[PDB]
Amino acid sequence: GGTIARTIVLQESIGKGRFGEVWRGKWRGEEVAVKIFSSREERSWFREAEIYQTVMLRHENILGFIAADNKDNGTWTQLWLVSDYHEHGSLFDYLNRYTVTVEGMIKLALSTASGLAHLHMEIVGTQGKPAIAHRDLKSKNILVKKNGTCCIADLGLAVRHDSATDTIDIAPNHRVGTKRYMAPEVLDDSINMKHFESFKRADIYAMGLVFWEIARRCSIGGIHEDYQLPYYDLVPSDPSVEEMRKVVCEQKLRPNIPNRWQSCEALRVMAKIMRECWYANGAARLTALRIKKTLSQLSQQEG
Ligand SMILES: Cc1cccc(-c2nc(C(C)(C)C)[nH]c2-c2ccc3c(c2)OCO3)n1
């Protein structure tokens, strides 16, 4: 029969995605993550399997895809996605559970930038990678590995660009992602969605919000902040598009950069990246590659 899903034994319920339910599984002795969709969730399943099967997608800071499969238990067909297990889980869960070192922060920050710069960069060739925008970049969708670098999951909302024709592989809706991480252009309806660079610019904003969440947990000599989500101070816990538009577009607040980040050098680089990631004009924002370059300077420096 089939060689993946037949041979996997589910052990623990991890939790829900947007669609489909996440499990700890044993494959051939090794631990795996399994994500399971109903027969009516087939568009979501297929599209996510389509993105992970993009040629040249595999980076150390993208989640390692094993396989899409079917599994008939006897009553009903389950649609499976199988991946690498990471015991720490999400960047959200890690930053709630733990503080980090100075070296710890940059490992989390660099890897997330490297992941998105890989995802964004077109690789021309016969085995050629399309440029890929995420559309839902957040701490819940980034996983943390056992080495303490990150990898990006939740590519099911992603869009892919052919540079020759200048087309996106789907006709994209307004307002698909997590409402809290939606960029100002996405919030106020103003984003042009036959411009591909705009979707990349929308991802850099949200990585800025992820970079804030990490930098709060940086324990220099006692002193760290608590875990918070971006706009904990300014919106409710499941916030509306209306509620988010009033803070980000109308009032023009980033997340608040505290005083003691000015003392340490590594936090000021991160603080400068954050405030260069927030910008209501998307064209003002940095590339993931310029962020990757800058953090890779800081990594190969301070003694
Ligand atoms: C393509 C694929 C296959 C299997 C799992 C996941 C997946 N989807 C998500 C969310 C963010 C909820 C959409 N998380 C995972 C995930 C992946 C690996 C894990 C894990 C969860 O817990 C520890 O190890 N995606």
Residue numbers in the entry: -1 to 301
Wording from the paper:
The TβRI–SB505124 complex closely resembles the TβRI kinase conformation observed in the TβRI–SB431542 complex. Molecular-docking studies and comparative modelling have also shown that SB505124 aligns more favourably within the ALK5 binding site compared with other ALK receptors, forming more stable interactions and supporting its structural selectivity. Clear electron density was observed for SB505124, with a heterocyclic ring structure (pyridine, pyrimidine and benzene rings) similar to SB431542 (pyridine and benzodioxole rings); both of them act as a type I kinase inhibitor by occupying the ATP-binding region and adjacent hydrophobic sites near the hinge region, which is the linker between the N- and C-terminal kinase lobes. The position of the pyridinyl ring adjacent to the gatekeeper residue is further stabilized by hydrophobic interactions with Leu260 and Leu278. Two hydrogen bonds link SB505124 with ICD: one is between the benzodioxole O atom of SB505124 and the amide N atom of His283 from the hinge region, a feature that is common to many ATP-competitive kinase inhibitors, while the second hydrogen bond is between Leu332 and the imidazole ring of SB505124, which is also stabilized by Val219 through hydrophobic interactions.
